[PDB]
Assembly symmetry: C3
Homo-oligomer: 236 residues x 3
């Protein structure tokens, strides 16, 4: 295994496990049901990812596949543990944003469905040879568009409607999510699974940076935002 990959996995595991300690002890100490739910959701997020990173750090959850002539020179290292992690953790992150926005349940169900299909077709893409890999990559990207038509549409609207004097708070919530979410397909397609701009070591580093941003630091941002809304009296 690439050394940069090896190190990125151990570093992601430890950072994610730090988040699990914060969220887990928060759930243990929370008295209000809405804080128990928040912490339990975000504890699952970091803990599932921390398990996936532990497996990759130990040399598991990976399969190496040959590339064709319609692909980058060499091979692709498919860390299928990533998609097992993502199919569970990304619907939970979206669920958390939706609960903070207080949006109706039909939008929650629609955004979770779009997200699960985005991940599933992403994993099909990763295992596919070209040109099928590229067809599935585009299908996965269109499911990502459907996530954002729901998020920046009905979810954001319900967030602005049911809260007062917190436009900048929710703007940061949706803007920061929007940025790291769109970075994943870019990081993916610039590696060996698309254009051979960089190899599996750099890709592993970039994904790890995205993962700790989305699961630990973004979680802390939603935590702080919940505190702000509670001190204002518009949390529940």
């Amino acid at each position: 295994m690439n050394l940069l990959s090896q190190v990125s996995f151990w570093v992601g595991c430890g950072i994610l496990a730090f988040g699990s300690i914060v969220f887990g002890l928060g759930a243990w100490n929370a008295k209000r049901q809405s804080w128990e739910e928040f912490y339990i959701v975000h504890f699952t997020v970091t803990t599932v990812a921390a398990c996936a990173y532990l497996a990759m750090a130990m040399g598991q959850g990976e399969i190496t596949l040959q590339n064709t002539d319609l692909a980058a020179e060499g091979v692709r290292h498919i860390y299928w543990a990533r998609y097992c992690d993502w199919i569970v953790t990304t619907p939970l992150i979206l669920f958390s944003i939706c609960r903070l926005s207080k949006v109706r349940g039909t939008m929650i169900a629609g955004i979770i469905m779009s997200d699960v299909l985005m991940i599933i077709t992403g994993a099909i893409a990763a295992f596919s040879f070209a040109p099928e890999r590229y067809v599935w990559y585009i299908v996965s990207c269109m499911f990502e568009v459907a996530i954002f038509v729901i998020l920046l549409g009905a979810v954001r609207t319900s967030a602005m409607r049911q809260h007062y004097d917190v436009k900048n708070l929710f703007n940061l919530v949706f803007t920061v999510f929007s940025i790291y979410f769109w970075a994943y397909p870019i990081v993916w397609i610039l590696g060996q699974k698309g254009v051979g701009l960089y190899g599996t070591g750099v890709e592993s580093l970039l994904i790890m940076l995205l993962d700790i941003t989305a699961k630990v630091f973004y979680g802390f941002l939603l935590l702080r935002d919940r505190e702000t809304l509670q001190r204002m009296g518009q949390l529940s």
Copy 2:
């Protein structure tokens, strides 16, 4: 791949994707929550199947297995993508019928459980050699019986009790479902997985006709029925 199979997959993909356009744009435009839920459920149904048909059309999601002497002459083409599709789409079709009938949640949970086990044991059957394949086929058929004791019993009863002057409407809902649902195990057992009456091409054509009936045209029937009930004032 068989040409009739190849064509049936492309034809099913396009027809299913037509349904996804109808249901998806209906969800986008729906103002009432109960219409949002209806369209989102049926959009998932056609879209998941359309993805499975795209994979099979492109030559993926299939494994060919040898038959024993207790089986039809030749081999069996197992399109395992079918069961990944079915384990998600058939509980959603049943959920839609149950919501239209306004039945209590315990019956919804019971019918979904029976259905998921029907599909799982069906996939075990398909991967099994004889005689195990035949044992699992019978077990799967008994789970299908359990679906209908719930459907034609408590679900239908609650549909007739909580609605007025729409006996013929609900009769068609349960009768049309009953017919295509029982056709699947027949189509399955007359192909190479049971009696060798026809090969994988004809079976692929028959399944595709069942799939577009159940997911597109039956969906349009439930759509029209929802409109009828709404114009009568007994939708919610």
Copy 3:
């Protein structure tokens, strides 16, 4: 296959199928929704396990793997059908105990999450070589600790708070569960997957005895307890 294994699988299948008859006919005959839910949950428990035992009895659902020098002499027989069964049946048993205790939903979600991760890391452990197998075994055991901090904490507390004059009833509910639940990791680690104290035949017998205890006889205990609470008037 080991004869003791062969017999234990057929015996477990028949005993589990006996439980499915009791719980299934109870669901069919139940008039109150809360009894319908109880029977449907416990019918799923025995029926899913009975399917898994039928597969193992017929020689399916098993893979044999080589052991290293950091492991017991010989091989490990991994019945992966067990974990497919467990990932579905153990969250349902916990759900049933939580509903009987009338605990808030956040605790139900937390205990189900801990349980699913316990089973998943257990299956990773089983497929892993040493030393990874031992790392995952410990991780799985820590998820089991997290189940019991929730169960003996918030769930038990809510059981004592919302019921009168039934301390001994609930004490038996949590004590009997506690005992068989902790026996599983012990049985697992004393077989070929840990210390080579006994082989796959004895392990298969011990698991089968645990499985019928947890799914049939413990189910009958919760049934009798529900009857007691109903005759007292504190069931719902």
